[PDB]
Amino acid sequence: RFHSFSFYELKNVTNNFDERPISVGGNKMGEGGFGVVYKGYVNNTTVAVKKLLKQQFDQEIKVMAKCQHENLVELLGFSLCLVYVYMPNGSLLDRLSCLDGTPPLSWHMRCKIAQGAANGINFLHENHHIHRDIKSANILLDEAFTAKISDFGLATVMTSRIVGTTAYMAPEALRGEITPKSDIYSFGVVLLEIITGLPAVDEHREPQLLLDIKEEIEDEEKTIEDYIDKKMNDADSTSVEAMYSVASQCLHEKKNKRPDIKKVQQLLQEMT
Numbered sequence: 627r628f629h630s631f632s633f634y635e636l637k638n639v640t641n642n643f644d645e646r647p648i649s650v651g652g653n654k655m656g657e658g659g660f661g662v663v664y665k666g667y668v669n670n671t672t673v674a675v676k677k678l679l680k681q682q683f684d685q686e687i688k689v690m691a692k693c694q695h696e697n698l699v700e701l702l703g704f705s706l707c708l709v710y711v712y713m714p715n716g717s718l719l720d721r722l723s724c725l726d727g728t729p730p731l732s733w734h735m736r737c738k739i740a741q742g743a744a745n746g747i748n749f750l751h752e753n754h755h756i757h758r759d760i761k762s763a764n765i766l767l768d769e770a771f772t773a774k775i776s777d778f779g780l781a782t783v784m785t786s787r788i789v790g791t792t793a794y795m796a797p798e799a800l801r802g803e804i805t806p807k808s809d810i811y812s813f814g815v816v817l818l819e820i821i822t823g824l825p826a827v828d829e830h831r832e833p834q835l836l837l838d839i840k841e842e843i844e845d846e847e848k849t850i851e852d853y854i855d856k857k858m859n860d861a862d863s864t865s866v867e868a869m870y871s872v873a874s875q876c877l878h879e880k881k882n883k884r885p886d887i888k889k890v891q892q893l894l895q896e897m898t
């Protein structure tokens with residue numbers, strides 16, 4: 627169960643919700659889609675307090691109650707505020723872009739993160755849950771750089787309101803179709819970010835969308851080697867080509883042609 631926390635019990639921990647950076651001496655880290663994530667303390671135990679939508683608050687708690695795994699973030703409590711075990715190495719997105727002078731992730735580290743994330747998605751799917759917002763900003767990293775999937779506020783059926791990040795969304799997801807296959811597509815984009823070290827979308831880039839590179843490689847214009855993150859010293863053609871092959875398979879426009887998360891895990895496992 628999650629501890630019954632009051633707004634008062636969680637206002638003090640955040641230093642009356644101090645909206646200043648930690649690098650200068652504050653309590654604000656950054657935003658998290660539907661809120662702001664603040665650094666907190668519950669008896670010499672660092673926590674992540676997410677101040678935020680009411681139904682999305684309710685959905686995180688329901689999914690978190692049913693799903694406990696090595697590769698999912700941990701919900702400790704709630705009050706609107708949600709309390710989690712603090713991920714000291716922030717998001718995969720921040721680490722791929724070396725935000726705040728953090729050193730680049732090695733190829734070895736990237737393979738472990740890719741494997742962990744897939745174990746996380748597999749656990750969710752095995753428990754009949756579709757994430758609906760798989761992206762590098764939602765893949766957090768612990769003290770050992772373990773990938774932990776987060777943001778279950780949005781977790782074949784059609785919907786009136788299309789929700790998720792467009793740069794990561796599957797064609798059918800953008801058309802309002804909810805399927806676990808959409809999560810596979812979104813994971814394929816994350817694998818492209820791992821290989822390239824590039825964000826899924828950059829308005830000041832040619833191509834603006836990262837999944838457009840899949841078509842430059844497919845139509846023999848370029849190769850995966852021309853796009854490998856130059857901030858690595860340990861990558862090898864074989865494992866890089868193996869991870870690209872998985873991403874390519876994930877990024878099929880036809881949902882039935884994409885692999886299931888179990889086949890994805892297996893392929894990433896074979897890779898190492």
Ligand SMILES: NC(=O)C[C@H]1CCc2sc3ncnc(O[C@H]4CC[C@H](N5CCOCC5)CC4)c3c21
Nearest residue numbers: 655656657658663674710712713716717776777
């Ligand atoms: N899905 C999420 O929103 C992550 C939340 C929910 C569950 C948890 S557990 C946890 N532990 C640590 N940080 C956390 O989110 C930080 C949010 C700001 C980020 N920023 C981007 C801009 O630049 C600064 C960093 C870095 C990560 C979290 C989170």
